[PDB]
Amino acid sequence: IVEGSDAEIGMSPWQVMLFRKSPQELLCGASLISDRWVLTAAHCLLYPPWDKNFTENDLLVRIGKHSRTRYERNIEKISMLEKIYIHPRYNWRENLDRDIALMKLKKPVAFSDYIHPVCLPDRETAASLLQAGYKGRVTGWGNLKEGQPSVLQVVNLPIVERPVCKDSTRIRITDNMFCAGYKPDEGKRGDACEGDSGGPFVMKSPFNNRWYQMGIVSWGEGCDRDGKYGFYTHVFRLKKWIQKVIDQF
Amino acid sequence: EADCGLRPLFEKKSLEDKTERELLESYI
DNA sequence: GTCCGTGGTAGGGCAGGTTGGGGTGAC
DNA sequence: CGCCTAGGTTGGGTAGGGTGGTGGCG
Ligand SMILES: *C[C@@](*)(O)[C@H](CCCNC(N)=[NH2+])NC(=O)[C@@H]1CCCN1C(=O)[C@H](N)Cc1ccccc1
Ligand SMILES: *[C@@H]1O[C@H](CO)[C@@H](O)[C@H](O)[C@H]1NC(C)=O
Ligand code: NA
Ligand code: NA
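Structure tokens for the assembled complex are given below, as produced in the milestone run.
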């Protein structure tokens, strides 16, 4: 997270840490949608270009954390994966289209004051909040520039018009992703960076005062660059998929 | 799942975080 | 108005599955 | 006894803290 700031303890209780067992290094971010289902970016588990391909037994999940490194006793809860589910349409070669994936925990997690699930959006919530100018919140223990934060970072970024998003990168944009961030003449700055992938792009509904995950930190050219913007996976367009996956398994 | 989007140290304590409003004030 | 499947990220086989819908639709 | 900064699946913020039970020093 670039041009962000220290998060308020318990302000992102759905924030999950995708931790690699050996070597013990922070891999990506993720969101807690239920007691046994965690949502993250597919490119975090499978990205051949960097010979990246992890199995359930290779990864660890840390929930309710605020400190990036230190083990937060009696607060932090660690769970392990039973199965990984990467969308069959995930295109890792060209434009990381549908850069989403579900992770099923082996044992249900116990909710606390630091551990709680985020809401998935319905077609109505998605039709009200998904608009240019409408600001969303992004969190993660990713790089501060192109170094590493002490505690969880948070930044507020507005949704950008699709045309601007498209003409800002040479990559081919799809209906399964949206770009967010400030423009050059807007004065304010901020953006996500490496290690923030899988992190949620939540928005608070002014109709039921509930936080909804609308996007997933996917890709972007560099970090916090002028003219360039960060892209997030369109959660709603895939909910249908999420629903029947969590259902059948 | 039916109690989602409600933080126990905020919404459930009728308290706001310091940057929330920025988000709500962006709806025009 | 039109377009969003038969290989692509990839098998087997032309549907449909965890996948080809639908939408802030884009053009 | 109050200061001082400290291991662990773990910093130093302080011996509680969003969490246990722990010292050495002057
Ligand atoms: C895996 C994530 O941690 C990371 C997040 C990047 C977010 N950047 C900004 N500014 N918010 N994602 C990546 O690094 C992705 C995955 C692998 C390649 N990648 C990129 O961003 C490339 N640099 C660009 C790209 C490559 C291929 C297809 C689409 C985009
Ligand atoms: C990733 O690893 C798994 C487990 O070994 C393997 O079955 C699968 O074929 C690999 N996928 C790629 C794209 O390399
Ligand atoms: Na197919
Ligand atoms: Na301690």
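Chain A touches chain B at residues 8-11, 13, 33-34, 112-114, 116-120, 133-137, 154, 156, 158, 203-206, 208-212 (CB under 8 Å). Residues 9-10, 24, 64, 66-67, 69-76, 78, 112-114, 150 of chain A lie near DNA strand D (CB under 10 Å from a C1'). Further analysis is deferred to the final report.
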